[PDB]
Design a protein around this ligand. Structure first.
Ligand SMILES: COc1cc(Nc2ncc3c(n2)N(C(C)C)c2ccccc2C(=O)N3C)ccc1N1CCN(C)CC1
Length: 125
């Protein structure tokens, strides 16, 4: 039930950038969400082999997780905040797609997504 390679956290032919908003997404948004009691399942790529979820990547073709996002922010991999925000949204949606409404992991994603939205509602100038 193999795992694919994790998403890239660097790419030499993609241009880098740093903005106040991206800095905030690392220092305030991600680093605060990371400490939430429901954050742990999202801190690394889904290990389908270890979790006995042999169809996870048969279903999910654009995997994402906060470990990957953190490294991308640390790499200055993103062009802008919206690009990073898209990754968070992909992570949450993957969780909703693979699982069913009401599942424990879905309850965790829903709580984190609310907190995430609360925190990006206002970004620095
Ligand atoms: C035990 O460790 C971990 C276990 C997990 N396990 C995990 N990682 C990801 C899970 C997921 N479980 N769950 C439940 C089962 C929640 C799911 C169960 C069924 C279907 C889907 C999921 C699921 O969607 N996700 C995100 C993730 C990260 C860690 N960490 C290891 C140490 N690392 C420093 C911090 C994070």
């Amino acid at each position: 039930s193999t795992n694919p390679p994790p998403p890239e956290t660097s790419n030499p032919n993609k241009p880098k950038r740093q903005t106040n908003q991206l800095q905030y997404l690392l220092r305030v948004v991600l680093k605060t969400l990371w400490k939430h009691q429901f954050a742990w399942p999202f801190q690394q790529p889904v290990d389908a082999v270890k979790l006995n979820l042999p169809d996870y990547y048969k279903i999910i073709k654009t995997p994402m997780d906060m470990g990957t996002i953190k490294k991308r922010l640390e790499n200055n991999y993103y062009w802008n905040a919206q690009e990073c925000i898209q990754d968070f949204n992909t992570m949450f949606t993957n969780c909703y797609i693979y699982n069913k409404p009401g599942d424990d992991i879905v309850l965790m994603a829903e709580a984190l997504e609310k907190l995430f939205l609360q925190k990006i509602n206002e970004l620095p100038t």
